[PDB]
Amino acid sequence: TGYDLSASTFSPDGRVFQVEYAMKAVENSSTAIGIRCKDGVVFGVEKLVLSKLYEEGSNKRLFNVDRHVGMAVAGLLADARSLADIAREEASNFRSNFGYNIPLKHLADRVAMYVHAYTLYSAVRPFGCSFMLGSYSVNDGAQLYMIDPSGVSYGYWGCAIGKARQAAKTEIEKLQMKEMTCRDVVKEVAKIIYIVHDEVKDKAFELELSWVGEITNGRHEIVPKDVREEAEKYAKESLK
Amino acid sequence: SFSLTTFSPSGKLVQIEYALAAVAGGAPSVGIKAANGVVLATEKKQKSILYDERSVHKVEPITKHIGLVYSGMGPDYRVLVHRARKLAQQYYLVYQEPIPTAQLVQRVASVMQEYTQSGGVRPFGVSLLICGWNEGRPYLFQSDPSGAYFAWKATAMGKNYVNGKTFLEKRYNEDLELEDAIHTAILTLKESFEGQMTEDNIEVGICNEAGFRRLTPTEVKDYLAAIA
């Protein structure tokens, strides 16, 4: 038909299929989830082990955009690291401009505007990656935003990206996440990770968890191995 | 950056051919040059009462002694408005005088030719009808998207323009006062227009020794009485 060839050419129904196909590439990526509470925001990501030949800590899926701003990306890892440095340039230029840390709503806007700029031009291609952006502050509080390949940000009490999303979002709705504390939320995050992954296609994986909130003193910090193993044992109590 | 307008196997430009077919189906517009003034009567038709007639006007002046009407696309016309008005400004910058209509239409029609050559751009979809007053002699010119500008005593443009030209061919002749020029421009406008005719449906303006001025809906209603 030739209508879906370029993003600058509209479909007969008034849509851009090039942006839609970039979203279908995100559905093949591994699952990553996050939840915000009064104490902070808890991150988790399923990092698939491709081979035993890879060193521990390889293919880190927990991205740090800014001191108070964490990020988890599911999609093409080439466009992921691209936007990763670009999002850091926007946060660095912000502090080079206004002299403090950019709020999460203002950062999600500038990044999403940079994502939508490539959907207009036919000489470039849109991003094939989708990601969530958490933050915490004493004036704002725990905040969680997700940006799609089309460059639109939505506020979320919780979100799930990658292959399995709607299934993980319903499990979060079954229990109130607001009054919980990040110590109890990571217990549910690891619980959902074990529910999402079964042995059918994928073989093995590793739990990559991250915290921001009162426990981390409002700064983006990875979860240590000691607490990670103890958080797994809390999920090892059930599985079922 | 490659030219979208190319020569057909018959030699004619394909892109400008649809430009002339676009302005042929626009809003009906007529004009007449008679005696010391030129009458411009166009069609502004609103699809509902919610529409405010004072917000958007189709008849716009280029300068004091010059005015212009149009039949064709809306957006391409306001691009012509800005550039033609800025051309009259850059004129008054250099020459510090009111611009002659012949020189105004010439360099504005050259802008229409730039997009029949430069790549990645479509030609204009608007056919301009220019009115001007210089040195005591009235001016009525007609320009199309092709870039070729002509001169006419009276003409018609827009939907059913062939009838308006034949009507003025029969009725209109020399020795018509400005009062008769308005009345004659209304009669040829009654033919192309269909339905009830009010002061809001038609937008009329004239240019005379006092310059180009647009008619208020009050005096238009006086001419709707078939008086002058």
Binding site: F10, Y156 | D76
Partner: protein, 237 residues
């Protein structure tokens, strides 16, 4: 090639511009704004499909400046992109011409932005149409609407989205009979317009209503408590 890039069709039309109009109905929303005597009111539907979705982060009512309100009907990606540039153009007015931009000159520069997308085949047009309100100190309240083609005109009331002709048809009932337009009365017609066409009876949490008045030139979105006060009292009569 007339249906791929923007070039003259055999009849002289532009199909890429027409598909930009068909991209408006793809949003799945309907908005209405009525110009009143001393006021201008915008009423749009607030959609929160997910329980986890934060309602405070989903807003269809946008603020271009203090005295100008905004609402976007169309593709959400194109909508938030134009408003950012609309705020870039509105601030460029004050940095240049010195005073708060009027709603007419604001819709003109925004329309000129869509004119560049139309004439040039390099950049595609945006599938969103902007509806702007405000109050000019001379002619009073000003309510305008700009389509992706670049057309704008003064409207006594505006309609956009899925419901267009039917929304205008109810607005014709009020203007032809020449009713009296006041702050409450215009909210009476705006809620009734969207409620009767969609067969809903909107709740205060289901909608968001921006308002501007002569006494309150600053644009403000009504609170659910006030919307409820403007609901049951509307349902009273």
């Amino acid at each position: 090639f007339d249906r791929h890039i923007t070039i003259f069709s055999p009849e002289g039309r532009l199909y890429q511009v027409e598909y930009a109009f068909k991209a408006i109905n793809q949003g799945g929303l309907t908005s209405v704004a009525v110009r009143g005597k001393d006021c201008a009111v915008i009423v749009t539907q607030k959609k929160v499909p997910d329980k986890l979705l934060d309602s405070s982060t989903v807003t269809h009512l946008f603020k271009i400046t203090e005295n100008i309100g905004c609402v976007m009907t169309g593709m959400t990606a194109d909508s938030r992109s134009q408003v950012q540039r609309a705020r870039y153009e509105a601030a460029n007015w004050k940095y240049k011409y010195g005073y708060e931009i009027p709603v007419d000159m604001l819709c003109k520069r925004i329309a000129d932005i869509s004119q560049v997308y139309t004439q040039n085949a390099e950049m595609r047009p945006l599938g969103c149409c902007m509806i702007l309100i405000g109050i000019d100190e001379e002619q009073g309240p000003q309510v305008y609407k700009c389509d992706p083609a670049g057309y704008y005109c003064g409207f006594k009331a505006t309609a956009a989205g899925v419901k267009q002709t039917e929304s205008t048809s109810f607005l014709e009932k009020k203007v032809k009979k020449k009713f009296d337009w006041t702050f409450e009365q215009t909210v009476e017609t705006a809620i009734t317009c969207l409620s009767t066409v969609l067969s809903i009876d909107f709740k205060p949490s289901e909608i968001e209503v921006g308002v501007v008045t002569v006494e309150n030139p600053k644009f403000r979105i009504l609170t659910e408590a006030e919307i409820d006060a403007h609901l049951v009292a509307l349902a009273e009569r």
